[PDB]
Amino acid sequence: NTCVVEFQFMLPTSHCQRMGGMVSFRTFEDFVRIFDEVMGCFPQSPTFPEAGEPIHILNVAIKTDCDIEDDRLAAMFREFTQQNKATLVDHGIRRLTFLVAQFPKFFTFRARDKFEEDRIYRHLEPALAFQ
Amino acid sequence: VNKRMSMVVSGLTPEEFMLVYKFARKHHITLTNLITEETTHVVMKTDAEFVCERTLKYFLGIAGGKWVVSYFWVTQSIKERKMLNEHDFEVRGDVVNGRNHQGPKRARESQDRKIFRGLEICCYGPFTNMPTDQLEWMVQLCGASVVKELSSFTLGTGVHPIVVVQPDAWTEDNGFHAIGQMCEAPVVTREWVLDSVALYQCQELDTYLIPQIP
Amino acid sequence: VNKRMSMVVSGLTPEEFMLVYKFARKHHITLTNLITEETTHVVMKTDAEFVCERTLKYFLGIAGGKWVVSYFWVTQSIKERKMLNEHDFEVRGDVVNGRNHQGPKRARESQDRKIFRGLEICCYGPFTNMPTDQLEWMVQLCGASVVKELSSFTLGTGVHPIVVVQPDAWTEDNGFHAIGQMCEAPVVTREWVLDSVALYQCQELDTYLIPQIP
């Protein structure tokens, strides 16, 4: 029940490396049951190269095309972060952005080490917000 | 030297074993395929009410007083991104011998009064789904003195010899009904031991006694 | 009791590990995820010429003189439904230290003369991808005497002290250049040990010597 893309990038003087995961889903509910593969690949035994920190991005696509009720909306969405701050416990996650579709309405909850959710960046993805 | 963490699993599909291995993988926890004295935790596949199947590792786990926990403890610590407490998911029983017989639980907390302490058990081959030497380890773990051959039975009033057979494994012969003529010991099916082990309480032989020929 | 067959696997992706767990179960073979003194067999992921990758378990396998065989013995048994001879699948080398250096083979055949018997090696934390106590177990299995702290070094003409560090593991700090001021001993990288263990032959320190600051 989980569709995964992997992210891989680095800092261009934004503020070295980290990975990410985006998964596209129908309802936010289905995610938290479909939780367990996102945390599955967070893999391969340790290697020993030659002789001689939150690092996960998370964006979730959601549907059910709801409307104005940002309070009841994001509050429900928010208490997923506050119920499992475990995300922070699993070697920390940089960002949890919730994306609800119809342009996509973002519900950005970023807690790399932080409070769950940032208010300036709601309705926008902070990589593109840099513009 | 101190003991290390060590889990074994039972009743899992292949895809499911990797999840326990993955749990063991993250925290370098020992995970074996044969249950031994070095094995410390036994992970059982259960339903929502922490009721499991009867496997070789379940019985052998009880005999050794090892931590017998439900497989749902593993999925939940990963599922919730925390390191939850194993004890909340301990299995309480099975679908044959009772829904709350607390066999595994009593065995861990009662290793000082093993159910077969002071009993002499002969593991009478052949066996299916359970090696003879593993059943011997089981009764060994339960305080019984293992007797390898019928002539080695102790003769005495204070000794309690018991011949344990599995009627199911025999198909060519009815020989298990004649041991009582050859020795002084009750003859019961292996399920008496397994049930006694499954419950960790020495059951009364009455329902499991095997008829002898006078 | 005599020792039994007991395997660990190394360098396998999760999907490959699942094939071995099913394999070990049918013939009641012990299969663990952590390598110990009781472990007798080490199953390595290799190429077609029995040349493998460098993992934590590969080195530890050689140090203990355990049977080191290739992962391909399992894959071959399904195609032909036989249990072919493992010795035919002994790993011959690795992609770093040589394609035919026979490290594992010599280790089995040289358990009476371990290469670091009578040497004092100091395993200097911290480490990544390898627990400190496991490398200590590694050099212990190869006959070295572990010295926990620099002041605890044995002082004598017959003693050869060595401080082992991993320059890669330090971040924030340049500490591997200051050991010469802390003790009277050559300082070499952990990779010298790792190469020595992988080959089971004491390598020349020259290329691995770590520059000190006077």
Q: Which of C184, C196, C213 is nearest to C98 (CA)?
A: C196
- Sequence-distant (≥ 6) Cβ neighbours of residue C134 within 8 angstroms: C56, C60
B123: phi then psi, degrees, rounded to nearest 5: -80, 95
Strand residue runs (E) in chain C: 6-10, 30-31, 41-44, 51-52, 67-70, 93-94, 120-123, 145-146, 161-165, 187-189
Which experimental technique did the depositors report for determining this structure?
cryo-EM
Q: Which of C62, C61, C57, C53 is nearest to C95 (CA)?
A: C53
Classify strands A95-100 and A105-109 as parallel, antiparallel or unpaired. Answer: antiparallel
Rounded Cα distance, B43 and B46, in Å? 9
B72, containing H or E segment: helix B72-79
Whether the CB of B75 is below 8 Å from some CB of chain A: the reply is yes
Classify strands C161-165 and C187-189 as parallel, antiparallel or unpaired. Answer: parallel
A56, containing H or E segment: strand A56-62
Token pair 């599955």: residue: A40
User: How far does the CA of residue B76 sit from the closest CA of chain A (Å)?
Assistant: 10
Sheet holding B67-70, edge to edge: B30-31, B6-10, B41-44, B67-70
- DSSP letter for C129, please: S
C69: phi then psi, degrees, rounded to nearest 5: -125, 160
CA distances from C14 to B15, B22, B50, C20 (A): 10, 8, 28, 10
Question: Which neighbouring-strand residues pair with C146?
Answer: C121
User: How far does the CA of residue B131 sit from the closest CA of chain C (Å)?
Assistant: 9
Cα nearest neighbour of C26 on chain B: B33
Token pair 């802390």: residue: C182
Rounded Cα distance, B139 and B68, in Å? 18
- DSSP letter for B98, please: B
Rounded Cα distance, B30 and B33, in Å? 10
3-state secondary structure of B153: coil
Token pair 């003087």: residue: A13
Rounded Cα distance, B103 and B200, in Å? 5
3-state secondary structure of C181: helix
Rounded Cα distance, A97 and A20, in Å? 12
CA distances from B45 to A105, B92, B93, C112 (A): 42, 12, 12, 45
Work out the angle between the directed axes of helices B132-141 and B190-199 (0-180°, nearest 10): 50
Spell A55-76 as b/e; 16+ CB within 10 A means b.
ebbbbbbbeeeeeeeeeebbee
3-state secondary structure of B51: strand
Asked whether the beta carbons of C130 and C139 are under 8 A apart, the reply is no
- Within 8 A of C34 by CB-CB distance, chain B residues are 4, 28-31
Rounded Cα distance, A37 and A58, in Å? 13
| Euclidean distance between the first and the last CA atom of chain B, given in angstroms as a whole number | 56
The DSSP code sequence of A96-109 is: EEEEE---PEEEEE
Spell C57-68 as b/e; 16+ CB within 10 A means b.
bbbbbbbbbbbb
Rounded Cα distance, C106 and C86, in Å? 17
Whether the CB of B24 is below 8 Å from some CB of chain C: the reply is yes
Asked whether the beta carbons of C67 and C39 are under 8 A apart, the reply is no
Q: Which of A43, A47, A52 sits opposite C129 (nearest CB)?
A: A47
Strand residue runs (E) in chain B: 6-10, 30-31, 41-44, 51-52, 67-70, 93-94, 119-124, 145-146, 160-165, 187-189
Cα dihedral A44/A46/A51/A56 (nearest 10): 80
Asked whether the beta carbons of C200 and C107 are under 8 A apart, the reply is yes
Rounded Cα distance, A23 and C187, in Å? 49
C77, containing H or E segment: helix C72-80
CA distances from C171 to C27, C42, C127, C175, C176 (A): 47, 33, 11, 9, 11
C189: phi then psi, degrees, rounded to nearest 5: -75, 165
Classify strands B145-146 and B160-165 as parallel, antiparallel or unpaired. Answer: unpaired
Q: Which two tokens stand for residue C148?
A: 């926990």
CA torsion sign for B27, B32, B38, B43 is: positive
Rounded Cα distance, C80 and B2, in Å? 44
Cβ within 8 Å, pair C97-A45: no
Asked whether the beta carbons of C200 and C62 are under 8 A apart, the reply is yes
Cβ within 8 Å, pair C96-A52: no
Asked whether the beta carbons of C39 and C64 are under 8 A apart, the reply is yes
Within 10 A of A128 (CB to CB), how many other CB atoms are there?
Answer: 7
Whether the CB of B15 is below 8 Å from some CB of chain A: the reply is no
Asked whether the beta carbons of A55 and A49 are under 8 A apart, the reply is no
A22, containing H or E segment: strand A17-24
Q: Which two tokens stand for residue A13?
A: 């003087």
Asked whether the beta carbons of C135 and C146 are under 8 A apart, the reply is no
Cβ within 8 Å, pair A89-B79: no
Classify strands C145-146 and C120-123 as parallel, antiparallel or unpaired. Answer: parallel
Spell B199-213 as b/e; 16+ CB within 10 A means b.
bbebbeeeebebeee
Classify strands B67-70 and B41-44 as parallel, antiparallel or unpaired. Answer: parallel
Cα nearest neighbour of A51 on chain C: C191
Instruction: State the best of B7, B33, B43 to mutate against chain C, taking most chain C CBs within 10 Å.
Output: B33
Alpha-helix residue ranges (DSSP H) falling in chain A: 28-38, 70-83, 86-89, 126-129
Cβ within 8 Å, pair A86-B81: yes
Question: Which neighbouring-strand residues pair with C189?
Answer: C165
